[model samples]
Target: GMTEYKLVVVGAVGVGKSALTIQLIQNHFVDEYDPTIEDCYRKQVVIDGETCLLDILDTAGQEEYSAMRDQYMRTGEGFLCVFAINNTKSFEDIHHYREQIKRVKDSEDVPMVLVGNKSDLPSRTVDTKQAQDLARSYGIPFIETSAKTRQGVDDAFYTLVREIRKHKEK
Candidate 1:
């Protein structure tokens, strides 16, 4: 009675990647945890009358464990490339993630969403327009999410799901 989707979350270390991932799979927010060794979380949700089993890989953006990237990146149907809105470095680093996904999937177009996380904080180093323009350049949807406020969390995940379906429409 459902479809299963594998989505990968990627970005530089400490950009609230895990926050967004956990928020989607569970209802609560975790402020801090030892960076994981690239693990997956699965949950079922309904979108547009379709039940989806989202098996999301919350990768170890933990410093050196970034080595495990290609293994999981090779398997995801879609990706959530996350960055912290208040941190410019994470924003700049978003470029690497999308490219890697394309290379692994061996396609020019893959269903992906540009996510700016930690939006609950008032400060902004990576402006909203900047993210919009970047996503525009890549022809992908851009969403700002705050795990703490539970804002845009489901939307980001659902949008990526739609993007995956839209990609296969061709």
Candidate 2:
């Protein structure tokens, strides 16, 4: 039997949430910013030699879509909370995403991975240490990824899948 998982990608606009999702499944980088409302992509992955299908939701990061977040959170079994390392405001907004996820899921122990995206950028306003500190405070795994370079992209999704598997086992 094949296992299935739902993972939601949440973050501020232009934070590369959609790019990360596309990069993970499609193996390509999207430079254009076409805002997403609720797009889903399916990909088959192997986790510990077990075939798993990941239904990834690329959620809209704009505040205009705030009302839709609860629905997304409700359906998601795991989450990828992302931020653009080049923008401090996006980094700060990640906290709000986490809080909303917790509120919607009604569980503080929701499986999540904190991703600092755009690591390939030259001018980064959000440092790695800062992201690490925030993840430490929330007690979640932190990863830095560059969708343009495909760095740490697979690891972020795989790690979150592992986390979801652990939660499911419990």
Candidate 3:
């Protein structure tokens, strides 16, 4: 038997939220900057030797969609809060993303992961230590990923699934 989970990806605009979500399940990198309203992708994955179906919702990062975010968050069982390593402002907004999840979900004990995307870029404005520190403060797993290089992309999603499983079990 396979368990199904809904995972929502949230972050600031142009922070590689869609890029990382698409890369994780599709294994392809999209270089375009077309804004998203809300998109979903389904992928079957094996975690801990058990089949799991993940329905990943890639949400819009634009301010116009802010009103719809709580609805998205409420539907999610797990979350990936992403930020770009090359943008410090994006990194700063990560807390707000997590806060929104907690506010909408009405729980601080939610399955979540903090992802720093665009690790392949050399012009990083947000260092690893700073990102790690924030994740540490939140007590969530922190992963640096490169959608172009596909590094840590799987790990980011996998970590969230594992957290979801644990949360569900509890």
Candidate 4:
């Protein structure tokens, strides 16, 4: 049987962390009510044939919630660093998110999945090459997602969980 694992979804404000979480959990994308703050709990996912349970910690992407970021990172076994394809600045800030992940995870080999959300809108793209390059540079898997289209969302999280499971085998 697969064991339980903690997966944290992180990103800058308005990067769609909450929307992504809802999409992943409900298989539907609800419009954003307001920007996220502090932290929030959604639900869990059970991957078929894998005993692993994904306890998703959906967190705020605001700078004011940095303390909560540290709290989530400390216990996080995996992370999906999200960014909006519509926002260039959000894409540029992925490095900062990576640094935070490293600081809290405290290991170079910690499992991470770089997620570029809002893939359904092609005109909104920013940092396409940079996002791919950054993910490659870190040797982490990357995926572009559209919650509305249900594209690549599950693959991103599932891949990360599977990677962590593989690492645990070592």
lDDT of 2 by residue, 113-141 (tens): 99999989888999889999999999889
How many angstroms is residue 5 displaced in model 4 relative to the true structure, after the best TM-score fit?
A: 1.5
Q: Report how far residue 151 has shifted in candidate 3, in Å.
A: 0.3
**Model 3: per-residue Cα lDDT over 61-130, one tens digit each:** 6545666667778889999998998888888898788887899889979999999989998998998999
lDDT value for candidate 4? Answer: 0.80
Error of 4 at 110 (Å): 1.4
Tens digits of per-residue lDDT, candidate 1, 74-104, equal: 7788999999999999999988887778887
TM-score of 2: 0.93
Candidate 4 clashes between residue pairs 3 or more apart in a chain or in different chains? 2-51
Q: Runs in model 3 with CA error above 4 Å?
A: 62-67
Give the TM-score comparing model 4 with the true structure, all chains together. 0.87
Query: Worst lDDT window (10 residues) for model 2?
Result: 61-70
Q: Give the residue spans of candidate 2 off by over 4 A.
A: 62-67
Question: For each candidate, what is the lDDT?
Answer: 0.87, 0.88, 0.86, 0.80
lDDT of 3: 0.86
Candidate 4 residue-wise lDDT, 101-145, digit = tens: 887878778888999998998768676687889899999898999
Count the clashes in each prediction. Answer: 0, 0, 0, 1
TM-score for each of the candidates: 0.93, 0.93, 0.93, 0.87
Roughly what TM-score does model 1 have, to 2 decimal places? 0.93
